[PDB]
Design a protein around this ligand. Sequence first.
Ligand SMILES: CC(=O)Oc1ccc([N+](=O)[O-])cc1
Ligand SMILES: CC(=O)Oc1ccc([N+](=O)[O-])cc1
Lengths: 752, 752
Amino acid sequence: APESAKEAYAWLAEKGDFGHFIGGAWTAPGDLFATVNPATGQTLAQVSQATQADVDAAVKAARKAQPAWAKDGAARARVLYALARLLQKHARLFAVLETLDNGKPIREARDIDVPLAQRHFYHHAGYAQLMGTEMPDRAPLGVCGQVIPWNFPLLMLAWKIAPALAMGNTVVLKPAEWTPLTALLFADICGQAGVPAGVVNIVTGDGAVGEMIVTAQVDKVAFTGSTAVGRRIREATAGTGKALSLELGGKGPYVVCDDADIDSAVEGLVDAIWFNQGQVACAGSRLLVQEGIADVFHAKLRARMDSLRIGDPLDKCIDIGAMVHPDQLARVRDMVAANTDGEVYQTAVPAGCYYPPTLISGLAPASPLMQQEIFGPVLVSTTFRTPAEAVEIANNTAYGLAASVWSENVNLALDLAPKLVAGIVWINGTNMMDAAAPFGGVRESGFGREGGWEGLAGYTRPAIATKSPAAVAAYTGDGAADGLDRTAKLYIGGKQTRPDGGYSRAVYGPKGKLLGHASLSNRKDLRNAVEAMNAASGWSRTTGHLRAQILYFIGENLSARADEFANRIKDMTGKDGKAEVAASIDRLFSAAAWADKYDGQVKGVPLRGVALAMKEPVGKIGILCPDAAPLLGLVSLMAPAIAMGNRVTLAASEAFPLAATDFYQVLDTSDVPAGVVNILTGAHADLAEPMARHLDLDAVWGLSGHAQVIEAASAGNLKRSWTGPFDPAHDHTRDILSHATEVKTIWVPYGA
Amino acid sequence: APESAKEAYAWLAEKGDFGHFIGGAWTAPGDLFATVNPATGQTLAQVSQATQADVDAAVKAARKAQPAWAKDGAARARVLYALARLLQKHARLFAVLETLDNGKPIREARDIDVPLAQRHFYHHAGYAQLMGTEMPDRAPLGVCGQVIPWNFPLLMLAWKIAPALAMGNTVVLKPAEWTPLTALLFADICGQAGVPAGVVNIVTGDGAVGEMIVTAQVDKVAFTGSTAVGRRIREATAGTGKALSLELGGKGPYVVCDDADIDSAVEGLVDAIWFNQGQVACAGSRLLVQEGIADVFHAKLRARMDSLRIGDPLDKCIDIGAMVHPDQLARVRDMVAANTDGEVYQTAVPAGCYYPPTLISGLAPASPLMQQEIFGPVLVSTTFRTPAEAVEIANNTAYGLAASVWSENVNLALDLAPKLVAGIVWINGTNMMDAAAPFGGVRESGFGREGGWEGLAGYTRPAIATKSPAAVAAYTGDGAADGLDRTAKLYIGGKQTRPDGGYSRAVYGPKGKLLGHASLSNRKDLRNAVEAMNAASGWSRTTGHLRAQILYFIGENLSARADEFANRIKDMTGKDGKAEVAASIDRLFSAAAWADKYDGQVKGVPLRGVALAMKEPVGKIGILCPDAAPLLGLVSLMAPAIAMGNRVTLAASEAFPLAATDFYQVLDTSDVPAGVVNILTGAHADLAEPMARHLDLDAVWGLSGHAQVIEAASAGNLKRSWTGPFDPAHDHTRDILSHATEVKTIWVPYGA
Ligand SMILES: CC(=O)Oc1ccc([N+](=O)[O-])cc1
Ligand SMILES: CC(=O)Oc1ccc([N+](=O)[O-])cc1
C-alpha cells in the first residue's frame, strides 16, 4: 500500500490558493494557475504567476531585512539549525509533497532528497556561527536572487538558501514553474524557525518571473538550470556588478574499466537512471565501458533494468515514477524519435506519464547522442579500448560537471580521476552528495561552487572595499621623427613579434618628450597568443616546486634591473618608480611562495570515504591591465595566475606600455617557458571584446573597464570573468589565487 | 672510478681544526677530538667539544640577533632562498663531505640528501614571505635549541633550521658527535647567504653539549633522536615554559598484502635497507607479509638483496656504505647475537666497517626483534593471515611514526591506512619525503610535526598573549551539618558514581553559606574514568555530523537551564553568572560548528601522487580546569575536544565545583555516549600527577598549574601536554582544535 498523502492534502487545503511569501507574510492570491500531480493529472493547488510588482516588493523586503540579519552570525546559526530541525520534524510531509508535486518515487524523496536538505541546513548553521572569527575579512553581498529547476525542488532550494543565509544575505527565490509546492511549505515553516520577516521571500511563476528576479536590484544571482538560460542570465546581468554563479548542463560520463567491480558498477548505474534528470551534478547518463567487459556489462545492465518497478510514486516499492510534466515526456519521446544510431532497449511500453528506463547502446565515440542533451530516464553507451581513450571520449564535450570512474585498482582509479574535465569525480560511486563537499562546473557547465567552505566565497565580498584606479589618458606630445630604433614589439610564444596590423603609437612623457613607440595589437595577435598558450599546455601539469623556481627567477631578474625599471616608470608618469618596482618584486616573491602552498581540502563526509576538494588551474586566462601601475599592475596579475599553473596573455597598461615591454627581457632571462606569459600592448577597446569572446580562453580578467562588453561576450563559452575592483597598490595575491583556480572534488574510498 | 674528494679535502684543510660558529664568526679551536671517515679510518678534521661557556655565548648571540631578524619576513625569505641556492651550487661538495663524514653511498647523498635539503630551504623561504599576511595571529618563539642525529646530518639540519628561521626565530644547533662536518660547511656558507650574525649558531660536541643546549635560555627545544633521550629532554625542560618537539624512535612497519604489486614492493624495500637507520620517519624495517605471498615475496627479496653492492661509498655504483662508527657496528652485531628466533639471511660476510644487508624472517608477531629497537641494515619479518591481523601486529608497539601499505586494491589500501597508528602512511611506496608534507610521531615516537604549514605552529606563539587567571581559594564556613541531600558525586561512564575514597568537602559561598558538598576524587576514580574512556573508543570513529548533533544538544540543553546555571555561579562566586553562561553556550555552538569542518590539507608534491595531511583525534585527554569560570572553563575545554573525536576526563574547578556537577544532567539529557565526557571534582594536588603519568592517556591539559609536575610525569609515555596559558574569557576554540588533533599524512597515487 502506498504512503498516505492525507497530511499533505490537509496542508494544501489549509493554504488554499497561494499568493507569495514576501516580507514574512502570505500575500493575496493573484493570477492563478493550477499545479498538477503528474501521476494522476489532478490539480493539487492553484499557484500565482507573480507580477513585476510582486518581484519588486520581494526584493524591497529582502533589502529592508538584510542589515539586521547580517549583524549577528550566531543568531543566524540558531535560525538555520531551527530550519533543519523543522525539515526533520516534518520530513514525511516534505517527502510526500515532493512526490505529489514532481512525480519522483517516495522512496527517493524520503531517503535522499529530504535528508540531504536537512543536512545542508544543519551543516551550514555552523558557517554562520564561525563567519565572524574564521572569515573576518569577508562580509555579506546583500540580497540574492535565486532560480532553481524542477528535478529536485526542495534540495535545490536548500543548496541556494542555506549558504546565502549563513553568510548574512537575504533571498528572493523562485521555484520551478512546474514544482512550487515544497518551496511554499518551506516558506510556511520560516516563521516557526524564527526567520525574521523578509529574510526569505518565495515568489512563484514562469521564466518571465525568473528574468524579473535576475534583473532586479540584487547583489548576487544564483541559478541552476539549462546552459541556454545560463547564457541569457550572463548577458542580462553583464556590467551590473552582480555576483553570478551558474550550475548548468552536462550529465556526466560513467567510465567502467575492465577491472571494475562489475556488479557494483551496474547497480550504481541502474540506481541512477531515475536520478539523472534535469540539470544536476550527476553521472551515469553517458556510459563508457571498456571493450573487454562491454558485452557482460550490458547484459547485466539490461537484466537489472528489467527489475526496476514503474508506477505509482506514492508506493515505496517503486523505482521509476511519473515524468514531471507532459512537456518533459514530449522531450524524451522526441529525442528518441530524432535518434537513428545505436540499439534501443526499453523495459516497458511507454504508457501515460510513465516513460520506461531506456538504454541506447552501440554508439560510436563520436555519435551525436554521446554529446547531445539527454532527457528522461535514458542512458547512452559507447566503448573504449584504453584508459587514455576513455579520458578522450569523456572530455569530448563542451561540458564539465560530474563524472564517475570505476576500477578496483588503486593506481588506475586515482590516475584517471584528475584527467577528467569536471568539478566532481566519484571513484567507485556516483551521485554522492554532502553539504561539506563542493560541487560545480567548468567549461559550459557554468562556474561557482555550492557546498563546503569553498561555497561561501561566492556569497560574500571583501569586508574592506577596494577601488580600481581611474583610467589615465596617455600623454600627448610633439610628434617629431625618431632617428633611433625605439619601437617596442609584442611578446608571444617565447619571442618578440611584430604586431600583425603593423601599427605602433608614439609614447610621450608628462612634458611631451618622445620616449619610444609601442605596438598596437589586434585580434590576429591575440589569436597567435592563444595558439602559443595551447602549445604551452604542459605548464598546467608542472609541479608547484618548478613554478615557484621560475617565479623566483623572475623576481631576482627584475631586482637586478630595479633602477632601470624605476627610471622607465618615472619617464612615463613623472613620479618616482622605486616603490612600484619594490612592490612588483614583492608580488613575484609572494606568488613564488604560494606556488606550492595553495592546498586542497579533505572533507570528512558521513558517506563512504572522503571528498578531496582539490585545487586545479583554470587553464588559459586573458587579462587586461589597468592604466595605472604600468609594471605592478601587470606583475600583480601575471604572477599569481602562473603560480597556479595557468598560461596568460596580458594586455599591458594602455597609457604606459613601456615597462611591460622592458619586462620581455626579464621573462627571457628567467627561462619562462614559451607561451606561458604572452604580452600585448595597445588599445583595450580593440582587445577587450575579442579576449572576452574567445572560445579557447577559460577566463577573462578585465581590470581596465569595458565590464558590460566583457561579461556579455563571456557568455559565448561561459568562461569565468572578473572585472574588478582591482587596486594594484594593495596586495590582492590570495584573492587572485581563487580567481586563478578551480575546485575539483574527488571522492575516494577511505577507512575512516 | 670513485668520486673525487679533492675539493672536500681542500675545504677541510682550509678550515683546519674547528672551533664553533657563534655570532657570525668562527671561534678559536678548543678541546679537540678527531672526526674520522668510517670507510677508511682516517681523521678528516679535529672538532671541538664545546664548553658551557661556548653554549652560553651561542645562546646569547642568538638572543641578541633575534628581534631585528623577526621584523622583516620578506628579508628572511631572501636569506632562506640564498641558502637553498648555495646548497644547490655547492651540492657536489655537500654530498661528498656527507659521504666522507657519515659513510653513506655518494649516490644517496647526491640524489636524496642534498636535493631534499635544498628543497626544504626553497620551500620554507615562502613561509617567511607569507607569515605576516597569512599568519597574522602568530609571532616567533625566540631562540631555538636544536639537536639532531648522525643518520642524515645535512637533511636533519635543514628540517630544523629552515622552519625556525622562516618563522623569525634564531637557532643554536648541535650536529651529532659523529657527523659534524656538513653542519660546519653549512655554517661556513651562512655569511655568503646573508644570514645576519648570530641568527645561526653551530656548536659541536657530545651529549653533554646537547644537554647544555636543551637546558639553556631558549624558548624552543627541537630534538630528533632516541626515545630514551627524548624522555630525558622532556624531564629536563619540565616547568620551564619551553616549547618542545620530539621526533623519536619507531622504524616503520611495511605491510604487504596478498594482492600487492610484489616486484614493486620488493624493489621499494630493498631500496630502503640502507636508508632505514637511526631515528628517521621511515618504513621497511618491520616487514609484515600476508601468508599467501610470504614465500614468493621473501624469495624475491633475498634475490634482490643479493644484487646490492657493498663497498667504497665514494663509488657511485655502491648501494651499501660503511657503518657510521664502530659503536654502531657493535650495536648491530650485538643485536644479531642476541636474537635466537627466526632465520638469518645475509648477503655477505661482515668485514671491517661494512655490515651486510640482513633479513631475519620467520619471526612470531610477538618476537623480541619485531618490537625491540633495530640497528644496521637489518629487516625483520613476520606474517599475517588477515588485514585485521596486520593492523593488530603493526600497532602492537609503543611507537607510531611512519608506515607503508602495499595493495593493488583501492578499498583495502585506503581502508588499512587510517587504521594504522602513525603520523605518516605511504600507499604503494615508502620513505617519500617533501618539504610541504608534515612528518612526526604519536605515542612514544614523540610529538610535533616537521614540514608544511602544519610544522610552523611549533615554531611560533600567539602574537597576543593570554594570561591564565590567578588561582582562587575555596571559601570557608562554619561546618554545620546539612539536613538536606546536597552532596554531589562524580560522573564516569554515563552515570553518577560515589568517590572511591568516600570523602567530600563542604562548599561555601562568599559569605559562608553552606551550598552543598562535592566529592574528593582519587586515583582509583581516575582509573575508572580511563576504563570508561576505553569502552568509548567508538566515539573516535564517529562522523563529524554525529558529533555536531551531540554538541548542538548540549548547547540547547544548557540554554534551557541558563538561569539555573547563572544562579549557581552567583551562589558560589558572589558575581552574576549570566555572561559566563552565555559564553559557555557560545563555546558549545562553536564546537558543534567545527565538528564537521576541521578539514585535512591536500599537498601537491613533486613526487608521485599527493600527500593528504589528515586530521585525526588525539584519543583520550585528561584535563584540569582553572578555579575561575566554574562553568565556562570546563565547557571551553570539553567542547572542542569532543568535537574532534576525543574522549575526555575533566577535573572541574577545585574552588567552585558545583556548576560542573549541575552539568551532569545536561550531559545525560543530551545523550552524550557513556565514557565520552567524564568529570571528577576535588583537589588538583591529588589529581595532577596521576593524570599526567597515566600510561593510558594520550594527552594531559593542565590549566590549573602544576606545570613542572605535569610535564615531568608526561615523559612516562611521552603523551602530549599543554599547561597554558588559558583564559576562559578568551575564545581559544581554534587553538584547542590543534591541541585536540593529530596530523596523519597519507601518501596516495594521483595522476596530477
Ligand atoms: C534573466 C534572463 O535573461 O532569462 C531568464 C529566463 C528564464 C529564467 N527562469 O526562471 O528559468 C531565468 C532567467
Ligand atoms: C637535556 C637532557 O636531559 O639530555 C640530553 C642528552 C643527550 C642529548 N643529545 O646530544 O642527544 C641531548 C640531551
